[PDB]
Design an enzyme around this catalytic site. Structure first.
Site, PDB file in Angstrom:
ATOM      1  N   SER A  26      -7.947   1.371  -3.241  1.00 14.06           N
ATOM      2  CA  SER A  26      -6.712   0.610  -3.363  1.00 14.06           C
ATOM      3  C   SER A  26      -7.020  -0.847  -3.687  1.00 14.06           C
ATOM      4  O   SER A  26      -7.963  -1.435  -3.149  1.00 14.06           O
ATOM      5  CB  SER A  26      -5.898   0.705  -2.074  1.00 14.06           C
ATOM      6  OG  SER A  26      -4.797  -0.183  -2.100  1.00 14.06           O
ATOM      7  N   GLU A  29       2.196   1.722  -3.491  1.00 20.26           N
ATOM      8  CA  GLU A  29       1.122   2.198  -4.356  1.00 20.26           C
ATOM      9  C   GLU A  29       0.815   3.669  -4.102  1.00 20.26           C
ATOM     10  O   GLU A  29       0.604   4.439  -5.046  1.00 20.26           O
ATOM     11  CB  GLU A  29      -0.130   1.346  -4.150  1.00 20.26           C
ATOM     12  CG  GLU A  29      -1.156   1.460  -5.263  1.00 20.26           C
ATOM     13  CD  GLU A  29      -2.351   0.555  -5.046  1.00 20.26           C
ATOM     14  OE1 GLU A  29      -2.403  -0.121  -3.997  1.00 20.26           O
ATOM     15  OE2 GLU A  29      -3.237   0.517  -5.924  1.00 20.26           O
ATOM     16  N   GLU A  46     -13.737 -14.517  -6.492  1.00 20.86           N
ATOM     17  CA  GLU A  46     -12.500 -13.997  -7.064  1.00 20.86           C
ATOM     18  C   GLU A  46     -11.255 -14.488  -6.337  1.00 20.86           C
ATOM     19  O   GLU A  46     -10.153 -14.379  -6.884  1.00 20.86           O
ATOM     20  CB  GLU A  46     -12.523 -12.468  -7.065  1.00 20.86           C
ATOM     21  CG  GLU A  46     -12.579 -11.849  -5.678  1.00 20.86           C
ATOM     22  CD  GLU A  46     -13.249 -10.489  -5.671  1.00 20.86           C
ATOM     23  OE1 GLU A  46     -12.884  -9.640  -6.512  1.00 20.86           O
ATOM     24  OE2 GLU A  46     -14.138 -10.268  -4.822  1.00 20.86           O
ATOM     25  N   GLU A  73     -16.539 -12.619   3.213  1.00 23.47           N
ATOM     26  CA  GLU A  73     -15.425 -12.331   2.314  1.00 23.47           C
ATOM     27  C   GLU A  73     -14.696 -13.598   1.889  1.00 23.47           C
ATOM     28  O   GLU A  73     -14.222 -13.688   0.751  1.00 23.47           O
ATOM     29  CB  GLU A  73     -14.448 -11.363   2.982  1.00 23.47           C
ATOM     30  CG  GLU A  73     -13.388 -10.813   2.045  1.00 23.47           C
ATOM     31  CD  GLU A  73     -12.108 -10.443   2.765  1.00 23.47           C
ATOM     32  OE1 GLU A  73     -11.505 -11.330   3.405  1.00 23.47           O
ATOM     33  OE2 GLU A  73     -11.699  -9.265   2.691  1.00 23.47           O
ATOM     34  N   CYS A 124      -9.045  -2.678   3.428  1.00 26.69           N
ATOM     35  CA  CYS A 124      -8.881  -3.745   4.406  1.00 26.69           C
ATOM     36  C   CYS A 124     -10.187  -4.146   5.080  1.00 26.69           C
ATOM     37  O   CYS A 124     -10.232  -5.202   5.719  1.00 26.69           O
ATOM     38  CB  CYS A 124      -7.865  -3.326   5.471  1.00 26.69           C
ATOM     39  SG  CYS A 124      -6.268  -2.798   4.811  1.00 26.69           S
ATOM     40  N   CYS A 126     -11.558  -2.479  14.882  1.00 30.29           N
ATOM     41  CA  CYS A 126     -11.887  -3.898  14.888  1.00 30.29           C
ATOM     42  C   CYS A 126     -12.062  -4.466  16.289  1.00 30.29           C
ATOM     43  O   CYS A 126     -12.572  -5.583  16.420  1.00 30.29           O
ATOM     44  CB  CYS A 126     -10.811  -4.689  14.143  1.00 30.29           C
ATOM     45  SG  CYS A 126     -10.812  -4.437  12.353  1.00 30.29           S
ATOM     46  N   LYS A 148     -15.741 -11.073   7.484  1.00 33.58           N
ATOM     47  CA  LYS A 148     -14.737 -11.994   6.964  1.00 33.58           C
ATOM     48  C   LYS A 148     -15.353 -13.328   6.566  1.00 33.58           C
ATOM     49  O   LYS A 148     -14.887 -13.964   5.613  1.00 33.58           O
ATOM     50  CB  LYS A 148     -13.632 -12.209   7.998  1.00 33.58           C
ATOM     51  CG  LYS A 148     -12.817 -10.966   8.304  1.00 33.58           C
ATOM     52  CD  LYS A 148     -11.996 -10.542   7.100  1.00 33.58           C
ATOM     53  CE  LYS A 148     -11.037  -9.420   7.450  1.00 33.58           C
ATOM     54  NZ  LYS A 148     -10.327  -8.904   6.248  1.00 33.58           N
ATOM     55  N   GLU A 207       0.820  -1.205   0.000  1.00 35.69           N
ATOM     56  CA  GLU A 207       0.000   0.000   0.000  1.00 35.69           C
ATOM     57  C   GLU A 207       0.855   1.258   0.000  1.00 35.69           C
ATOM     58  O   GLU A 207       0.509   2.243  -0.657  1.00 35.69           O
ATOM     59  CB  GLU A 207      -0.941  -0.006   1.205  1.00 35.69           C
ATOM     60  CG  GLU A 207      -2.073  -1.016   1.108  1.00 35.69           C
ATOM     61  CD  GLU A 207      -3.034  -0.926   2.279  1.00 35.69           C
ATOM     62  OE1 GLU A 207      -2.716  -0.217   3.256  1.00 35.69           O
ATOM     63  OE2 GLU A 207      -4.106  -1.565   2.220  1.00 35.69           O
TER      64      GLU A 207
HETATM   65  O1  HC1 Z   1      -8.023  -8.385   6.855  1.00 34.67           O
HETATM   66  C1  HC1 Z   1      -7.747  -7.780   7.767  1.00 34.67           C
HETATM   67 FE1  HC1 Z   1      -7.330  -6.868   9.290  1.00 34.67          FE
HETATM   68  O2  HC1 Z   1      -7.159  -2.587   9.218  1.00 34.67           O
HETATM   69  C2  HC1 Z   1      -8.488  -5.452   8.990  1.00 34.67           C
HETATM   70  O3  HC1 Z   1      -9.174  -4.570   8.884  1.00 34.67           O
HETATM   71  S1  HC1 Z   1      -6.965  -5.997  11.417  1.00 34.67           S
HETATM   72 FE2  HC1 Z   1      -7.594  -8.228  11.422  1.00 34.67          FE
HETATM   73  O4  HC1 Z   1      -7.165  -6.881  14.505  1.00 34.67           O
HETATM   74  C3  HC1 Z   1      -7.910  -9.921  11.019  1.00 34.67           C
HETATM   75  O5  HC1 Z   1      -7.996 -11.041  10.749  1.00 34.67           O
HETATM   76  C4  HC1 Z   1      -9.125  -7.895  12.399  1.00 34.67           C
HETATM   77  O6  HC1 Z   1     -10.081  -7.717  12.931  1.00 34.67           O
HETATM   78  S2  HC1 Z   1      -5.769  -8.432   9.984  1.00 34.67           S
HETATM   79  C5  HC1 Z   1      -9.021  -7.766   9.974  1.00 34.67           C
HETATM   80  O7  HC1 Z   1     -10.095  -7.556   9.914  1.00 34.67           O
HETATM   81  S1  SF4 Z   2     -14.417  -5.808  12.594  1.00 38.90           S
HETATM   82 FE1  SF4 Z   2     -15.534  -4.017  11.736  1.00 38.90          FE
HETATM   83  S2  SF4 Z   2     -13.882  -2.572  11.120  1.00 38.90           S
HETATM   84 FE2  SF4 Z   2     -12.879  -4.596  11.427  1.00 38.90          FE
HETATM   85  S3  SF4 Z   2     -12.884  -5.541   9.352  1.00 38.90           S
HETATM   86 FE3  SF4 Z   2     -14.776  -6.274  10.392  1.00 38.90          FE
HETATM   87  S4  SF4 Z   2     -16.374  -4.779   9.758  1.00 38.90           S
HETATM   88 FE4  SF4 Z   2     -14.369  -3.814   9.270  1.00 38.90          FE
END
Ligand code: HC1
Ligand code: SF4
Ligand code: HC1
Ligand code: SF4
Ligand code: SF4
Ligand code: SF4
Ligand code: SF4
Ligand code: SF4
Ligand code: SF4
Ligand code: SF4
Ligand code: FES
Ligand code: FES
Lengths: 571, 571
Positions: B318, B281, B365, B360, B298, B500, B357, B278
């Site tokens: 990005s 970039e 992809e 995701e 992210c 997070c 996640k 990043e």
């Molecule tokens: O992908 C990624 Fe990440 O600015 C981000 O966002 S931080 Fe993680 O403490 C993990 O797993 C967490 O929670 S590594 C993610 O979510």
């Molecule tokens: S915990 Fe919240 S801020 Fe962190 S990756 Fe997931 S949705 Fe985004």
């Protein structure tokens, strides 16, 4: 002390010969689930929930399997987890599930194991358990929640040596019952409550009296007074996240004041009064030298056992009432006249860690001195319901003029304390001088042994004394005494092993060392008081000089003594 | 600052004007029960379970009642307790009660309130709630356990400003639903998980993938590797009785090793790799001066919001992958060849505190780089199921060669950390010297404010940076940017307010100050590392010099970049 070699999950372990797999793996920080085994009882092998996998590939129960050289054990293989999940699903397929209505909510072990071992969908749905719930006095039995672990039967047979309950029927329809489903009152039950203390489900519970207390508090034409047992102040803090043996006296007094009780007293005043009465009676009996030995009468379960099984010892039992009934009589006969309240408009509530007190409060001979009896768990539930926070309370003191106590009455919650206090008062009465220094403590009657014997020399006169904590040890001592092997002068008996701190009304624990912690806390509480003798109490002297004028007097004999009758229903 | 004096339960209280009865009585250590109010939301007045009795004798809700001078309030009168008991009985008369099967077991608030306010026998038995449960992706919704408190709707409307759900029907048949009961994927949901974080019952939960992990572990022809998120190591200890913000890294690594995982790594290596990509970039974009501003990628929920509501910002996003997918690609494309394992025989598991996640990991992809995703609560449940004791574990270290990390990658679990690390690397790249002393910390981007704007000067060149934690603040920043009020160069967006550490997969809390404690713990963990820069990592240099040979190279662009498409289903 010969050690053995084994491998548990790839880690070498040094254990003595004879240790099971469970106790051997406990030293590696591994907790194997189990529902039918307890620290007081032999292994049974009924739940089949502690299975482990050995090198051959078979499932073996780890609670009754001795250790051997060159053994390989796996504790978290997928097969073991699958078997445990299937077994718990089989249990929960036939459970009546009023977890909203269950007294053991948030304290059940089946619920915690269902949470931890990840159950979310039962595949076996069908026939369930359905029985009828009947009143058994101060004990509530619901056979629809039983898992048939045998802990109650084993604790009643192996330890208590009473054998009041056993298994009935066979197969899917098995259940626990008394002969012919008769009520517990006329069975061989003595109401000690150790079976309620070890049950892992909500099948065995308590009879609550909270609604009557609330309806008497809301009554604007009554006065409510409460008395607290010596052993409640060391185990009440456990329910709020503290360690066993931590003193919460001021916090509990403040909480009780916030609950709506008008006056808060303590039972240790009645304990000193009972000590004085019993010591005078013992001195008179020793002078007369008749009806030996003399047994105490502070334990209702011991009195029930005497009335049912040993009706020939009634003339030898001390006639002094228990501290609870003495306090009730004092409150309803002396305090009310001083304040100016009619006897019919006074309510007395007691908080006790016992279950035999619930039955004792309803005996016809006491003329309904005490109106209700609570337990430590009920008090904790009331405190949590009212919303008071326990950690951040402000310490307060007991009310007047029946609140101040001494240190001799603070050790009735442990085995041997009553004998020590009685000896403390008797030495002063017999000799005339007061013990000073470390001579106050009698270390020969302290501990957690079965039968404790001592020979205290008081200015050239020797007395044979004995202490027996537990019903089984009481029976052994009775058999020893009756055969004429030796003669005693004063004997103490308590139905629960370890004293009143192991009562059936105390909060549930998981630590295997709760008795030692609670005993240490009780002794520490005793050591931190200004007075350590019963005759140094100030309000007892006032009560005598104002109402009774002498121990063992006519008024005292009328109001502070009782008589016993044989309950032996011959067949 | 003007004070008001009132009487609560006979105790004088002095509070500022405007404070409700609940917050005023909180200062006396009194907790009034309540189910429909939260610290993040305005009072609603739906549960009616916080009623108190005033001087006139009526019942008034204490969560939305302003305080006044000369007010008398009673909080534990019998009438209030009776009303609360009746209301809870009315609730529990129509609840489907598989508390054995409920995910929220031992964590439910309705269950705890049913225990505390002493419910034992429901008098109202009759019609219940009965609906159909449908799959909504990574979120599990059961309308048979809903109490209609509105917390999910209020949190989605007031705070998140998305408005993806609302009430449906009226009366006894009311329920929460999306338009036409459509699945959440094609609704306006962005999968942040804040509604799951505030629900007081087990109606809203997350989908579990534990069984696939167990069945892949038992497979003897596969290798299992696990990666741990930076924010899991400060909130995992809460589930075992510790305070928030306590570091349990070594304990959790040991526990994961005892759980059966062959290799344990951490995501911070991928965090440093993403930081390098990043920063390169961003430097190239600044040199070119095109497509400004640049947004991070992210957060999967931020990407979903961009794709659904703001499809014109796609060229400005990005293209670097998230650390989870970067780690998956590294493990399945570089580590396997080094070890000698086929791509089809490798299993990758991730432990994340996020809900987005889970969605995701299943995007087409990514070619199924990550096979399963867990949460902190699922990991705690697994640890408790296996029987390991967390308190008495032995500290261990991460495996090799993808285990060592720096301090710049340890602050991705809090808002503003990504910008701080990017600036740390960008200063070195642009100038050539290394920051020393206290200049490493950028205190102008730290805190818990809505929109944080800074102005960092790098050797005479000034860059405009902005941080917006939360979807609502993101929309406000977008509206500010589009109108042309000012121009930025780098913008960070996080869907959860506070970073997070406030994700939907974190353990439940009751303290109102969890954000501050967790942020302090994260910063303390960052402060205790030997390296505090991303270019100082040693394994990243080896990975470049062995496989990719340059950042933003052809192989890197093929394997470490992605593209986005518009999801705006026009109507
Ligand atoms: O992908 C990624 Fe990440 O600015 C981000 O966002 S931080 Fe993680 O403490 C993990 O797993 C967490 O929670 S590594 C993610 O979510
Ligand atoms: S915990 Fe919240 S801020 Fe962190 S990756 Fe997931 S949705 Fe985004
Ligand atoms: O009556 C009496 Fe008593 O040797 C006795 O027994 S001790 Fe008490 O800590 C109380 O209440 C307790 O428990 S006062 C009783 O049971
Ligand atoms: S109360 Fe005591 S005697 Fe009665 S059944 Fe239980 S253990 Fe046996
Ligand atoms: S009543 Fe309780 S202790 Fe007795 S067998 Fe049933 S579950 Fe076990
Ligand atoms: S005994 Fe345990 S599992 Fe059964 S209803 Fe009571 S709390 Fe629930
Ligand atoms: S020893 Fe104490 S708790 Fe046990 S039965 Fe006797 S009085 Fe009750
Ligand atoms: S996940 Fe987020 S956007 Fe979706 S319904 Fe819940 S709060 Fe609203
Ligand atoms: S789903 Fe949960 S948060 Fe939403 S209304 Fe129902 S109980 Fe409340
Ligand atoms: S939501 Fe609460 S009360 Fe309802 S079944 Fe689940 S744990 Fe029990
Ligand atoms: S504890 Fe081993 S079979 Fe029950
Ligand atoms: S918390 Fe006051 S009405 Fe719900």
């Amino acid at each position: 002390m010969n050690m053995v070699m084994l491998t548990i999950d790839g880690k070498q372990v040094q254990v003595e010969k004879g240790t099971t797999i469970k106790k051997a793996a406990e030293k590696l920080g591994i907790e194997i689930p189990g529902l039918c085994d307890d620290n007081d009882l032999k292994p049974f092998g009924a739940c089949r929930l502690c299975v482990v996998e050995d090198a051959r590939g078979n499932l073996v129960a780890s609670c009754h399997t001795p250790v051997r050289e060159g053994m390989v054990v796996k504790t978290n293989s997928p097969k073991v987890l699958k078997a445990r999940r299937v077994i718990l699903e089989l249990l929960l397929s036939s459970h009546n599930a009023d977890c909203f209505e269950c007294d053991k909510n948030l304290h059940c072990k089946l619920q915690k194991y269902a949470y931890e071992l990840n159950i979310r969908n039962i595949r076996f749905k069908g026939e369930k358990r359905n029985y009828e719930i009947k009143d058994n006095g101060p004990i509530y039995y619901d056979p629809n929640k039983c898992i048939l672990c045998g802990k109650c039967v084993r604790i009643c047979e192996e330890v208590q040596h009473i054998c009041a309950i056993d298994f009935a029927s066979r197969g899917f329809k098995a259940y626990i019952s008394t002969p012919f489903e008769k009520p517990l009152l006329e069975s061989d039950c003595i109401f000690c409550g150790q079976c309620v203390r070890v049950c892992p489900t909500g099948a065995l519970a308590e009879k609550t009296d909270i609604e009557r207390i609330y309806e008497a508090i809301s009554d604007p034409n009554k006065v409510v007074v409460v008395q607290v047992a010596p052993a409640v102040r060391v185990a009440l803090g456990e329910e709020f996240g503290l360690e066993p043996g931590e003193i919460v006296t001021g916090k509990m007094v403040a909480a009780l004041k916030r609950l709506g009780f008008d006056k808060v007293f303590d039972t240790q005043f009645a304990a000193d009064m009972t000590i004085v009465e019993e010591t005078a009676e013992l001195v008179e009996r020793l002078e007369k030298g008749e009806n030996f030995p003399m047994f105490t009468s502070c334990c209702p379960s011991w009195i029930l056992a005497v009335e049912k099984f040993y009706p020939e010892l009634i003339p030898n039992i001390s006639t002094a009432r228990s501290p609870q009934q003495i306090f009730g009589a004092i409150a309803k006969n002396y305090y009310a006249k001083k304040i100016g309240v009619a006897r019919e408009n006074m309510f007395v509530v007691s908080v006790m860690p016992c279950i035999g007190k619930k039955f004792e409060a309803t005996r016809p001979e006491f003329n309904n001195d005490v109106d209700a009896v609570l337990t430590t768990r009920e008090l904790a539930r009331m405190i949590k319901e009212s919303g008071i926070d326990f950690i951040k309370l402000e310490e307060e003191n007991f009310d007047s003029p029946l609140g101040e106590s001494t240190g001799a009455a603070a050790i009735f919650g442990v085995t041997g304390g009553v004998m020590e206090a009685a000896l403390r008062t008797a030495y002063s009465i017999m000799t005339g001088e007061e013990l000073e220094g470390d001579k106050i403590e009698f270390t020969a009657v302290r501990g957690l042994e079965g039968i404790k014997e001592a020979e205290v020399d008081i200015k050239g006169k020797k007395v044979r004394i004995a202490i027996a904590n537990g019903i089984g040890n009481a029976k052994k001592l009775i058999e020893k005494i009756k055969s004429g092997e030796t003669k005693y002068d004063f004997v103490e008996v308590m139905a629960c092993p370890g004293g009143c701190m192991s009562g059936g009304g105390q909060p549930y624990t998981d630590d295997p060392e709760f008795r030692k912690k609670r005993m240490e806390g009780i002794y520490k509480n005793d050591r931190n008081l200004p007075k350590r003798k019963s005759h140094e109490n100030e309000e007892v002297k006032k009560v005598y000089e104002e109402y009774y004028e002498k121990p063992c007097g006519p008024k005292a004999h009328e109001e502070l003594h009782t008589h016993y009758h044989s309950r032996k229903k011959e067949y």
